Design a protein around this ligand. Sequence first.
Ligand SMILES: CC1=C(/C=C/C(C)=C/C=C\C(C)=C\C=O)C(C)(C)CCC1
Length: 250
Amino acid sequence: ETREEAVRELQEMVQAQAASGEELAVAVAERVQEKDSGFFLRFIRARKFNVGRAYELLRGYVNFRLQYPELFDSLSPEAVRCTIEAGYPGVLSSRDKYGRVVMLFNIENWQSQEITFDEILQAYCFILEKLLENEETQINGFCIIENFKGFTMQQAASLRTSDLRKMVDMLQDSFPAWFKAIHFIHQPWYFTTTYNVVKPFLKSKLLERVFVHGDDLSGFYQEIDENILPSDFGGTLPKYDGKAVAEQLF
Ligand SMILES: CC1=C(/C=C/C(C)=C/C=C\C(C)=C\C=O)C(C)(C)CCC1
């Protein structure tokens, strides 16, 4: 069967490339040695069974883990659960019109000293790992909705460029085959400074996936069904509660 053959070919390529001794190639081989066929199929299917292209995706995925080991070193499922229960980030029960999983972040009252940017990215990675077990999601991918209505100047001043770059790299290196769009709503005037900080690190393909809506949600609602969104993202569903997602995942 083509699936089993494709996985075997990807595995052989992982080994063949590592044979060169090239640093990342060697790291990939080491870092995927415990993975099952399902894991390899994610990359294979995301690249329409093009093994070479699947391997390139895998390189970026592993590179992210090499560059940001603090996100993976002492990962505790229990701690990740708490972050998710707190609603950071959230996940909708229904897919959007593109068949995408919709992830959520509402910055209002986010206290970075209580729940760190790193902890939030750990939660993203933990969720995406589970979400990508699903074969439709392996193709359709996901989007992110960011409600910045409550983005304060204090929050803005506290954001570290190294943390913003980490998020860029999560989307651009770890999950680029799956990250499809990010929608910022209700962002204040000083969002411009935050955006400008990140802009140099965004490749053109990723830049084209960033949308900023402010207070006019007309276009936004054309993308994401108002009737699938929680009330704190302008929708008709109950205010987002991280408990439901958390229970489903764990
Ligand atoms: C502008 C912009 C970004 C900035 C995101 C920010 C400012 C996130 C701030 C807080 C958190 C933790 C959100 C969690 O979802 C992205 C994602 C990096 C890269 C694409 C464009």
